[PDB]
Structures are given as structure tokens and as C-alpha cells.
């Protein structure tokens, strides 16, 4: 009897990360996984994206507990993919109960141009929509919208990607406040998690440790590693993706029933800076 | 097969009946010992009964229940000194302490009491959580979790004295806590505060709290009532339960949130959409 | 000798109402505009949308002033189409130097489901952002980005979910335009909201409309409606029409705004002066 | 040129500090859009004001530069800080003109330094918000449906919120609240108060040793070209300042009936500054 | 009295609306604790200001109560409004007393009503806020060390900032007493390193002409076409939230007397709120 | 008839510093004083507090002016305490007028464990709170509280004790309007006195001077010194008790008697730092 026992979950960006940390431990808990993924680079973002092989390493994870795995290539800025994947999806498991919407970018360094403020916007906020857009037609009573948001981008209230990244968070957050409204007389809700530094591929990127150590013209993960600290008032360097999946298991599970329109910090205390 | 709070001692403030009881059970189901403080006796400001000694020792029977170890004592959480007393007798019976739930609570409200009445809400639902963290902090350890009971209705803000007092407490007990947060960050400790709204206990199933959510009659029943308390919540419900509120408590009791810290953490139905 | 000469504009919602008075009013300015409108309903929408016949008139208005017109039948919620079609427009004009994002819908209605929030919005902002994202590879030195919002969608910051999505997407087109302003100055392209108050076209003219102004009515004909159009306003009108805004619209397309950036320009005739 | 139909056509527009600078392009402009203008400056020195104003030469030239536009100029030297002068001198160019349709309260001045007396925040604050109003009330008793009333900010003024410094902010900052009450006093009558915020602009302003101090903190006493190095920071797009006719295409949209139903706006000409604040 | 040593002793101070009201009150209290007095008022009406304004009289009867304390009065008509007729006067009393220590700029109007034209609006602005800022600016270069300026504020004029009828001149008083209030703290700032003073005080219900006045009875009585005095009585207390209609002008000169008095060397920008709590309600 | 004539004024922390300056000031205008102090010193608090002496000499200092004075060692973070000693004095004094809740510590030191926190917390508003509910019931219409907040407090919104200190101080502003919207009904007033640096023992102590001169370990008063002014736009290191008890006067008189809800800066101009 598990904390999430029988229900079905989207997560997007669920190839590698965050993502597939939520799978598992969701499925652990007892539910049935659709993931969706990109799988290839998007150009203005230089750091590799998930793969193919990391989809399916993420299906096959999920399956090992015991519970099944629809995988879909799907970029979350084509609506229409995500639409047609999803009733593939529901087709498979006649049913959706939580919306992960976790996929993102973040394209950042000041060389690059306008371009990768759209593309962290298209994928970071636009994609959210699509996704939630997508998947309201197949929402009842009882069901939970999850979103990703980024305590970085609330502070921001690094070039064009950084301010496209910080400013898609926030109208993560804001959008999530309104479509908590929205869906509440139908007992649906909507929150958004906003997490610190997590120890992942984003994190641990090239772009990012420059962004870190903006001293040094090229910074090493050790160099990088030495300035992850001063972002949480706990002393860590980062938090790590167990530590969101327990926050989204936790909204997943009829355990949060009542929870809706929350700005769920998993930061470590950043937000007290 | 491990519980989410597997070995870890919880004091809980108000611990006889409601929100408290309802703490103590779900952490002792999860693997605690519970130490149970309780007034067991009314407060003459306060226009609905408290907590009896029988409701206590039920709440600590309930515990034992589970196979875990449950300490109760009768301690007005206003007295410092006793709190500190009866927790030092405590702490070592029990080994440690990991977890402080500051739950207790009164709700005073009335446009006819007097002044009084903003006093002895403010001492007992701020003061209290003070003296209850406070007396705490010298026994806490890094990975140490500490819970507030704020309140919706509270951070929102014929209430009378008692409202006012009410409603200023539980808006310094959000606050405080997340002074508490950042002072207490660099040791690993956490501190949030949990936000309901409308909980079904005894606080709101009152007389007094009738008269605030009714103020179109004069002595209004339940059933009067139970019209009104819907508005509060934009989801389609009178209250939530103290189960609600449990499931948020566990959830930053356990090793499952340790980097949860300086959260306000609404179980409110969307209450505060609505402001 | 124009005040826009040989530029280059898109205009979305081109077909009729403030899209089209904008379109003749830079093309007697010496511009050569690319026209794109939906030319069909959208059900929760529950007024008509502009026409295919609309569209070819625009274009045909536009000509008459001695410059050139490309239309297209476009819905800028999808992007492909607006893309490709901007492209076609493109190679034929050879340069895009301004962009009005003007296309809308206000689908008001306290019946409406959720779906009206979303088509909204999807219109509203993403609408916008699509158009926008679409011509941001064409624009060069000195291009002048040109949004719609909306006063009454800022001062949101019964309606149902329509208005409520209606009044965040301009609440958002709003913030959006700012922040494209900063990441667009180093390249002095500049980017600008209108505000508009009430304004004289059938979204303004319409029934779900004449309801929202006036909720104290089952059944508002437009001359009830006409009778709570003013309050809108400090200036006595009932409202601003088409060319008031395509003055504002031209000032900010012409080279005599080369240095107005992340302004949100009101033209409410003091409708913001009410808070 | 001959029998023209302009944007501002047989307009009358008082224009304060209309002797040199934004004023004087102001004046200008709408004399080259139609309008017959009515130009006020001081035409002397203020002693907390560290660089020179306006001469009686530069007044005259100004009318003349409007002339040559083929339009009618009306000048007379008055001190905004004085109302009795500005009514007097007001009244005079309305019997002969026959009418008031804009005002352009322009006259200021940004008496700036670390080392200046108290009087430096008292002479800012007179000129810059005092002169202002002196401007407004004066010319209302000859406003009538359709007129338009146009306030001179400051970007720098708003990211505030020596003394001539500090009384400069603060007078611009009030300039600010003041249009927008006023506009909202006035639309009953369909009568418009905007105002226009402009970041740098390439004046005589600008262009002086109290500015140059000011941006460059760093060099004792600094020049021109030591400044130009530091007035970029100012806007977000690349430019150390706008010009004067930047400022005057939004007075021509302002005092054109195009801008009819424009009123209580906070009309910012400022190269993205505020974006940066 | 004479002979002992007061609370602004031989001290000089300017009043501004010193013929009647909180500013007679205020010269009459400096005077008992040893200042003397220079008595500002314009002693005729403004048009839009539909209640009488001092009289001469009131002017001379003000400067002989100053007298009947044993100190010094020196009164002269003055609109505050005309900056040049401040500095004329202002130069005269102080070449009479030889000094200048305190500036009380309290001169007001307060001309309410629906029907009135925006010249309402103006005037209240010129006279609450102009007449405020002449005061000020014609005292400064008369002014050392240990100065205090003090400003007139209103509670009632804050309250409106935050709120979102009292007709264009009673927009043009809260807009002016809004500005009253940040005018002085800029100020204080600025004189701060001189050690000169500036501080506004806000009363609530003040029980003087004031209030006291038939477009008062109106703002108070909406509810009325044409209310009295006894009906406005009874709406005057919901301003405050310790229960009376109004303070006296006595409770405001009692905070003028401390500001202006050495006792308050380090008080500065200062919002002093003499308002039996109504901000409380706000 | 002085300005507080006759009046019964309950002073803490009245052994030495402002709360022995109020306690003289109140006494030469006329009022008897009730004077209650810890007289010990509290362990995170790295200064010495006043001794039995002081409170003795305090009281001594009152009696000289004519008046009564009541003196009592008492800790304001023990209600019971409060409670039975001003019982006492009442019962002495036949009443209560005024009460200034003037005791603090500012437990500064960047060392310091999180009790600090607790410790400036519990002196500093729980020991205000204390001392105001435990007068509340002597209280009737004319009585006046006040209450000694900090514009460095307001400023913060150092180490645990220093954040302790302005959370405190920030909550003794917000607690004294809530008093004062309660009060008012009854006509008891509540105001809160927001003084800058004051020359105290608080302010000439070691963790003070590291706390102004953090660039330095063992910084001297001298030291200190140079940088006690930027905290006033008057040029000033501090104002001296007396400048307070002058605000404490106005307020305790009946003077005052419709001031109520007021943050009461005496602070040179601090604030106007923003
Ligand atoms: N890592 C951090 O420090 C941090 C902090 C705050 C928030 N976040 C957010 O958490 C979320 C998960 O990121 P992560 O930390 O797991 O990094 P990650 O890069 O490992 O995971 C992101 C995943 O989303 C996928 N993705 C990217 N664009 C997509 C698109 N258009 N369509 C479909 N899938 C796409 C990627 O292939 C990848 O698998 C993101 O929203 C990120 O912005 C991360
Ligand atoms: N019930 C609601 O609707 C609601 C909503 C928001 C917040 N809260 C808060 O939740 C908390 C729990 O209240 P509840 O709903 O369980 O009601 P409850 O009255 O059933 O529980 C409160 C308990 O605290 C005890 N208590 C009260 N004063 C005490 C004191 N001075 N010392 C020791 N124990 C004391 C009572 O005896 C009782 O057992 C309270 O802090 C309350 O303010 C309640
Ligand atoms: N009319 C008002 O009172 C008012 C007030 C404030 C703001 N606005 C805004 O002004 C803008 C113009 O609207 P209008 O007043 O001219 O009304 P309108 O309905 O006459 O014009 C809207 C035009 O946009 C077109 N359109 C709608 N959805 C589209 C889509 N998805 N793709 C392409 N075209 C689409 C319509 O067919 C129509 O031609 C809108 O953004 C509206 O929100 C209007
Ligand atoms: N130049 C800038 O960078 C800048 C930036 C923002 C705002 N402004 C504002 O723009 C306005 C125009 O100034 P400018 O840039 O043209 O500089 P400027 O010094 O060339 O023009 C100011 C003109 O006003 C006149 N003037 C000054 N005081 C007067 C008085 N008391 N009475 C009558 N006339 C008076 C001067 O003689 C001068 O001709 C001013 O209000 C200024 O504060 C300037
Ligand atoms: N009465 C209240 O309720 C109340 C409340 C808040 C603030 N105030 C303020 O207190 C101040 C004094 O008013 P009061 O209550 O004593 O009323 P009041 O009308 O009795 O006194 C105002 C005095 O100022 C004089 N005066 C008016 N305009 C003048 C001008 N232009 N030049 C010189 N003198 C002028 C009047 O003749 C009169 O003597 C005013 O600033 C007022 O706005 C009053
Ligand atoms: N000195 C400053 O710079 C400064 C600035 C702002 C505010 N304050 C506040 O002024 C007030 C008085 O301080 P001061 O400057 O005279 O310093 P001080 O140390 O000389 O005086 C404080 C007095 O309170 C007493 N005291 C401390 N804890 C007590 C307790 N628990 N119970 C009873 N008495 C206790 C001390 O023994 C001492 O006599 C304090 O609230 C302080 O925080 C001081």
C-alpha cells in the first residue's frame, strides 16, 4: 500500500534528473509512469540534454519496481506531441491523476544571444503550459498539478538564457497561484515547488560553474563547488533530487488533498538571504 | 519497512485532543516517542471548554497503542519555567529529542470580552511557542526539526480583543519562525510554519467561533454555521481535518524534509487565494 | 516624407478593429504591412472573430494608400504557421522592421468552463509570445516591438474564467514586454506595451461585454451597457476609438521613438487615475 | 512650408526655459507642426546653479529660430519662481494671441555638488517644482476642453526615490505625483496633464562641470570626454544620452489632438534607464 | 511666568495662521515658556474656502495675548501664498527681535465641497503646500544651529494616501498634507548636518474653525444635504479610536512646545502624530 | 505641580543607564517611581548588567528629588516575579500611572551559540510583554505605557544575540500599536520611544565596539568611536539619556494624554538613512 498506490503520473523531463528521481520514487510508491523527454540537444543550451538511452534507462528503472513505464520523445514546446503522446499514453493506462512538469533549460553565458532567452522561455514557461493545457482534459477530482519552479529565479525578482531562465520561474510560480484558483472548485490543485541548487547535469555544467566563478575564466566543477555553498543558509552545496521527490511525493499523494496554490521552498533556507 | 520518524522523540504541545492528538498518533504510527503537554483545564477569556486530564491520558494510551513510549504531563505552555521542567524530566526518560510540535492553542473570541482576552491569547499562542522553543532549543542537534501551528485566517488579517490577539500571535509565530530558521540554518536545524485553515476540532466546532462565522444571528447553531465555513476555502469544503494537518506535521517531522527549512507551509483548501 | 517610410510591419488581428486601424494608419505613413488574422470563431469565444472577407478588405485598405499589403489567414497560437507564413511575407517584402502584436479575444463569461482561462491565455500571451518569438530572427538595429495589453487587465492586478485569463495574459504581456525591452536594448530594437482603455470595436461591442458592465442586469441590451461604458473613464467618454491607439501605435513604429523602450503606454483617457 | 497643415496646427503653447535646449527644440518643433509659440525663461544666472542659464540673446534667437519656421513667437524674460510675473507676462501674450491650448513646463535647473549650502535644495526645489506649479495655475483660468498641460521629469529624479541635488530629485520625483493628480483634477474637463521622464539629454545640462563631477566621482575635476566614458551606464541602450529632439517628438504627440484621450501618463524617454532600476 | 526660566526660553518664533486656532494656541503656550513671537496671518477669506478665515482682529487680539504672558508679539498680515510679502515681513520682525529660532508653519485652509471648481483644488495646494514651502524657504537664511522648524501635517490627509464627497479642494488638502509630510523629512535630512530640526505633526480632529465649519458638517455628514453642527458631532468621533469627537488645539501645541524646545536637540524628521490613535484604524 | 505630578511610574531596567535617567527626570517633575532590575548579569550577554549597588543608588537618587521611590531585584523574564514585587509597590503606592519598559540586553558576538537569540528574545520582548501584562489590571483611563524599542532594530528589517535584539525590537513597534488599538477604548495610552545610540553601558562596551568596528579584533571605545557618528545624520556619535527621558517625559505627562500609536524616534536623524 503505497503513497501514491495505483495512480497514474506525467512527468516531463523525466529521462534524467530530477525527473527520473520523481519516476522512482512515485513508482516505489506505488504508481504507473508516463515519462516524456526531449532526448537531443536544443542549440542555444551548452550542456548535453538527456538521450534516447537515458529514456529508456528511466522506463527500466520504474519497471524494476514493479510498476509500468510509457516513454515518449517529446518536446514539451510542441503541443500537439505532447497531446497526441498523452492520449497514447492514457490509452495504455486509462487514467491521469498528477502532472509532473518538470522539463527545463537553462541556457545560460552572456556571449549568446536573444534567441536563448526565447528558447529558456519556450521550454521553461511555454512547455509548462503545454503540458498543463494538454492535460486538463484528462483531470477529475482529486488529481494534483506539480510544477517546477527555481528559488534562483525568485531572487532574480549570466546573459540572455539566465534572464529568460529567472523570469520563466517566475511566471512558473505566478501561473501555478492562478490555475490553483481556477481548478479548485473541482478539487484539482496546482502547486510549485522551487528548489535551491540540485545536484544534477544543470547544476553540474560548464555554463554554470562560469556563472558561479565569475572570476575565473575557466572554472572547474572544484572551482565551482567552492561557491555552491553561499546560496543555502544550511551548509550544503546543493540539495539533491531525492529531496525534491520526497516534496513531490509528498503533492502526488492523497496525503495533500487540501494543498493547493503552495510555493513549496526545498532551498535549505536560500530564500532567508 | 522503516517508519518516517523511525526512533526519533517528538514533544507535542496541546497534545490531549485535536490537531495535537491527531500529531501524536500519526508520529508514533511512523516510528516516535511521544512527550504529550496539555493545560487540562479552561481559560475564562477563552468561551469553549479545553482539554480534560482524561482527554491526556487517552491521548497518551493511544500512543502506547502503537508500541511506542508516550510521557504526559499537565503543563500550561505560558509557564516557562514548568515547560523547561517537565521537558528536562522527559528529554531524560526518553534519550533526546528530535522534533517539537508547538500546537497549542486558544481561540478567544467575542466582542464583549475585555482586554484580558488579547492578553491571554497572545500568551498562550505566542508566548507558549516561545516558551516551547525556547525550552526545547538547549537539547536539539543538527537534523533537529522544529513545526509552528500558524493559521490562514491569521496572515488574512466583532473578533473582539481575543480575535485581534489572535489573530496578531499567529501572524509573530510566522514570522518568528523564520527568524528562528535562519539563526538555526547554519547548525542544520529546521523551522517552518504550518498555515491551516478551517480544521475540524474542537476550536472550531465552539460557540464562539459560531458567533464569528454567523454574524448575522445572535446564537447560532452548528448547523448556521456549517453554511458559512465553505467561504474560507476556495475548494469545495467546510474544513479540512486534523489529518490534513498530521500529514503536513510527518512530512517536516521526518528526515524526508531535511532541507525544508523557513517554509510557510499552507494545508489550506486555497484559502489564501482568495486574499 | 512618412513618419513610418518603407518599413516593414506585421500586424496580428490585422483583419478588423484596432489591427486594421493600425494597418491603413501606417501604410498612409509610408509603410508596406504583412496583415495575419484567424478568420474564424473561437467557441468559448462567445462573439464573432474577424472573416476571411475582413482580412482581403484590410489588405485592400491598405493598398488603396499606394503600399504594399501580404495577408495571411493565421492563428497565432500556432507557431509553425506564423512562422512560415512570415517567412512568405518576408521574401516578398525583403525587411521586418516593426511588430504589432495586436491579435485578442475576451472570452468573458461566468458560465464558462476552465477551457475559456486557457484559450485566453493561449491567445492572450502565448498568442503573443509566438508572434513575437517568430520575428525576433528578422529584426536589425532600430526595429520597434509593439504589444497590446490592456487597463482593465491591470487594474484585475462573475468576469469567469475567461476574464480571469484574459486579465493575467495582459498582466503578463505586460511584464513580458519589459523584459524583452532589456534583452533587446543592447541591439537598439525597442519594445513597448499599449494600454488601452475602452475601445470602440465589436470586442468592446459585444454581448458578453454589455453583461460584464452590467452584472445588475439578466439581459443588458448595448444601450444599457452604453449607460456604464463611461464610468471606465476620468474623461467623459465612453470610450477611445481604433485611431487613438493608432496614434500611440505610430509614434512608437516611427524613428522619432528611436530611444522609448519598456514604457507602458497608457491610453485610458484616465481610466488608471481611478486606482 | 506655405499654407501647411501641421501636426499642432494654430496651436498657441506657453513654453517655460524655452530660450535654449529641450525648450527652445520644443518650441521649435511645434512651431514647425503649426503652432505660434509664447517662449518664458529667466535669462540670468542662479547662484547655487554652478553652470550659466540662458542669456537675453539666447532668448531672442530662440523666437527667431521659430520665426524662420514661418510661425509667430511672443518672448519675455520671467523667472518662474515669481507667479506675478508669469500671470502679468501671461496675460499680455493671451490678449494678443487670443488663446491657451499648451503648456510645456520646461524651465529648470540642477544646481548639483557636495560642497553647496542648504539654499542649493531651497533654489532647486523653487524652480523645479514651485515654477512648475507657478506655470500650471497660472495658465488654467485659460484652458478650455482640449488643452494640454505637459511636465518635464526626470529618470533620475524617479531612481532617487549634494542638497541642489538631492532638492532636484526630490522637485522631479513631486513633479510626477503632482501631473498625475492634476490630470485626474482636470479630466472632467477633458483638460490633459502628462509628464516626460528623459533620461540624459545632450544639453547645457548635461553638459556642464557640476555634471561631469557628478558621473565621474573618481577624477577631481573632470572633462567632457572623461564623462562621455561614464554617461552610457545611464541607459540600456548603447548611448551616453538622447537628444533634444527625442524629447520634443514626445511633446509634439502630447500636444497634438493624436494624443486626445492620453492623459496621467508617465511618459519615459529614456534609452531603457529604468529597466535597469 | 516672567521672572522663571521656561521650556523655549527667550527664544524667538514664527507662526504662521497665528490669529486664532492651534496657531494663537501655539504662540500664546511658547510665550508662557519664554519666547516671543512673530504672528503671521492673512486676515481675509479665499473664495473657495467656504468658512470665514481670521479677522484683523483675531490678529491684534492674538499678538495681546502674547503680550499678557510679559514677552513680545509682532504681528503682521501676510499670505503665505506670496513668497515675495513672507520674506518682506519675515525680514521685518526679525530686524525687530534680532533673531530667529523656531518656525511653526502652520497657516492652512481646508476648502471642501462637491460642487466647487478645480480653483479648490489649487488653493488648498497653494496655501498647504506653497504656503509651507515659502514659509520654510524665507525663514532658512535667517536660521543657525539648534533651529526647529515645524510643519502642520493631517492624520486625515495620510489616511487618503493609502484610500484610493470632499471635492477638488479637499483632494488638493490630502495631496498637499501627503506632501507636507515627505517635504519635511527631505528638509530634515538636509539640515540635519547643521543641527537644524524639521518635524511635522499630524492631529486628528483638531476642535477649532476648522472643523468647526459648514463644508466640514458636510464631509462628516454625507448622508445629510445640508447637516449642523449636532449632526456632525456625532460622526467627528469615528476618527478617533480613543473616544472623543476631537483633540484641542492645546494637545497640539504641547508637541509644538516640545519640538520647539531644546529638550528635542535630536528629534528630527519626526512624524508626530497627535491623533487619540486614528491611524490605528488605518 | 511638576509635569507628571503625583504620578506612579514603574520603571525596569531603572538601576543605571536611561532607566535610571527616566526614573530621576519623572521624579524632579514630581511622580514616585517604582524601580525593578535583574542586578545579575546573563551569560551570552558579554557586558556587565547593573549590581545591587546601582539599584539602591538609583532609588537613592529619586529619594533626593523628595519623592518615593520602591526599588525591587527582579528579572522582567519572570512574570511571577513582576507580578508579586509590583503587587507590592502598589500596594505601597496606592496605584499605577505610567510604565516604561525600558530593560534590555544586546547579547552581540558573532561566537555566539543560538541562546543568545533566545536570550535577547526573552529580555527583550517576552520581558516587555511581561512587565505590560502584568500592569494591565492597575491600569485605568489617563495610564501611559511606553515602551524602548531601537532604530537599529528597525534598520535590520551581529551574530544570534544581535539578530535577536532587532527581531525583538521590531516586534516591541508592532506589539505597542497593537496595545495602543486595544487600549484606547479605555484611554490608556501605548507608545513606543525609538532612540539611536545612547551613551550607556549597552553602547560602551566590547561586543558594541565590534560590532560598529568589525575590520578590528580588539577594537578600543576609540576605535569605535570613529564610526558611532555614521549612524546619525546630525553630527553626533549618540544622544545621551537624558535625550530620552526628555521623550519618556512628554509622554508620561498628561501632556500627552492623546498620543497613542506613535514611534517616537529619537534618533538624530538615523532613520533618515533609510
Ligand atoms: N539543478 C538545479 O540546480 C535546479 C534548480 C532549480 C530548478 N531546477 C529545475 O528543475 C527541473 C529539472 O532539471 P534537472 O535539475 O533535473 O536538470 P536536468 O537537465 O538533468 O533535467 C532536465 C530534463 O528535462 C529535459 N528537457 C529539457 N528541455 C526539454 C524539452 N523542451 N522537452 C522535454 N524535455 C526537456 C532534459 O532532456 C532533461 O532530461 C528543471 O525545470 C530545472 O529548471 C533545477
Ligand atoms: N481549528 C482551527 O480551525 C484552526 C485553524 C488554524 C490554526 N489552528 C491552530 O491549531 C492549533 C491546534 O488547535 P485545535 O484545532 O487542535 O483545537 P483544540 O482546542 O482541539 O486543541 C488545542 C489544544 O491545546 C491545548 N491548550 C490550549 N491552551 C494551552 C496552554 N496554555 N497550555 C497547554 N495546552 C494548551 C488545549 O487544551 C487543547 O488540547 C492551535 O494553535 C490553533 O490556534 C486551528
Ligand atoms: N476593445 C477594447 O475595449 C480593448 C481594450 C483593451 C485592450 N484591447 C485589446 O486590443 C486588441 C485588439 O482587439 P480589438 O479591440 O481590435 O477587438 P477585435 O475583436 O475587433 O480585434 C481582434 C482581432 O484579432 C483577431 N484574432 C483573435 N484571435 C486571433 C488569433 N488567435 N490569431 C490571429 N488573430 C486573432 C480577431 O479576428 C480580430 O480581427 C486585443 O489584444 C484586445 O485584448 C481591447
Ligand atoms: N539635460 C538632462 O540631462 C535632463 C534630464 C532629465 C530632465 N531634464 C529636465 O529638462 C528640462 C530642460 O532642461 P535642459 O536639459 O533643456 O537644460 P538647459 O539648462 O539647456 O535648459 C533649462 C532652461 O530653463 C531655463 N530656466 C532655468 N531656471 C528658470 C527659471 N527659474 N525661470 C525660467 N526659466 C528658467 C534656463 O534659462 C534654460 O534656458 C529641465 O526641467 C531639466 O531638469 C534634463
Ligand atoms: N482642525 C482640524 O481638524 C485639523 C486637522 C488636521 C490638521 N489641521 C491643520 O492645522 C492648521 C491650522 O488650522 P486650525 O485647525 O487652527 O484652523 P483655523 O482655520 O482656525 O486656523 C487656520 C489659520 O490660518 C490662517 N490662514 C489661512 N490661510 C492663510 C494664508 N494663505 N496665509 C496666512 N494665513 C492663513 C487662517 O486665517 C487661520 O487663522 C492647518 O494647517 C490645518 O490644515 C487641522
Ligand atoms: N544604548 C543604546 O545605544 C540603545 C539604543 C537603542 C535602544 N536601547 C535600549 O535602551 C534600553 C535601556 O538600555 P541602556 O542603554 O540604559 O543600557 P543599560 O545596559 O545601561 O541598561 C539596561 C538596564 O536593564 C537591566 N536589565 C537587563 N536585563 C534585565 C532583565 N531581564 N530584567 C530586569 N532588568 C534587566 C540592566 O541591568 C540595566 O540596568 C534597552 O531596552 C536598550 O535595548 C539602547
Do not use: W
Not at 509512469?33 to 537531443?40: E, K, N, P, Q, T
Not at 487514467?95 to 519556450?122: E, S, W, Y
Not at 560548464?206 to 566543477?221: C, G, H, I, K, N
Request: charged share 20%.
Amino acid at each position: 500500500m503505497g503513497r501514491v498506490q495505483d495512480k497514474v503520473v506525467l512527468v516531463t523531463g523525466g529521462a534524467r534528473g530530477q525527473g527520473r528521481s520523481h519516476a522512482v520514487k512515485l513508482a516505489e510508491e506505488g504508481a504507473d509512469i508516463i515519462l516524456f523527454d526531449i532526448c537531443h540537444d536544443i542549440e542555444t543550451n551548452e550542456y548535453p540534454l538527456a538521450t534516447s538511452r537515458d529514456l529508456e534507462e528511466a522506463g527500466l528503472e520504474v519497471e524494476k519496481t514493479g510498476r509500468k513505464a510509457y516513454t515518449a520523445e517529446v518536446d514539451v514546446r510542441d503541443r500537439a506531441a505532447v497531446s497526441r503522446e498523452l492520449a497514447n499514453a492514457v490509452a495504455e493506462f486509462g487514467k491521469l491523476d498528477v502532472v509532473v512538469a518538470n522539463a527545463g533549460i537553462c541556457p545560460l553565458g552572456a556571449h549568446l544571444p536573444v534567441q536563448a532567452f526565447a528558447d529558456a522561455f519556450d521550454v521553461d514557461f511555454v512547455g509548462v503550459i503545454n503540458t498543463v493545457h494538454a492535460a486538463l482534459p484528462y483531470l477529475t477530482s482529486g488529481a494534483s498539478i506539480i510544477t517546477t519552479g527555481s528559488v534562483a529565479g525568485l531572487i532574480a525578482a549570466q546573459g540572455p538564457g539566465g534572464a529568460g531562465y529567472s523570469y520563466a520561474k517566475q511566471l512558473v510560480d505566478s501561473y501555478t497561484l492562478q490555475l490553483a484558483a481556477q481548478l479548485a472548485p473541482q478539487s484539482i490543485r496546482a502547486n510549485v515547488i522551487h528548489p535551491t541548487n540540485v545536484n544534477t547535469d544543470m547544476l553540474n555544467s560548464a555554463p554554470m560553474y562560469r556563472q558561479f566563478r565569475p572570476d575565473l575564466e575557466a572554472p572547474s566543477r572544484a572551482d565551482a563547488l567552492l561557491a555552491f555553498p553561499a546560496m543555502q543558509a544550511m551548509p550544503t552545496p546543493y540539495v539533491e533530487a531525492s529531496d525534491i521527490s520526497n516534496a513531490v511525493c509528498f503533492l502526488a499523494s492523497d496525503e495533500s488533498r487540501y494543498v493547493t496554490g503552495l510555493q513549496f521552498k526545498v532551498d535549505a533556507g536560500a530564500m532567508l538571504k
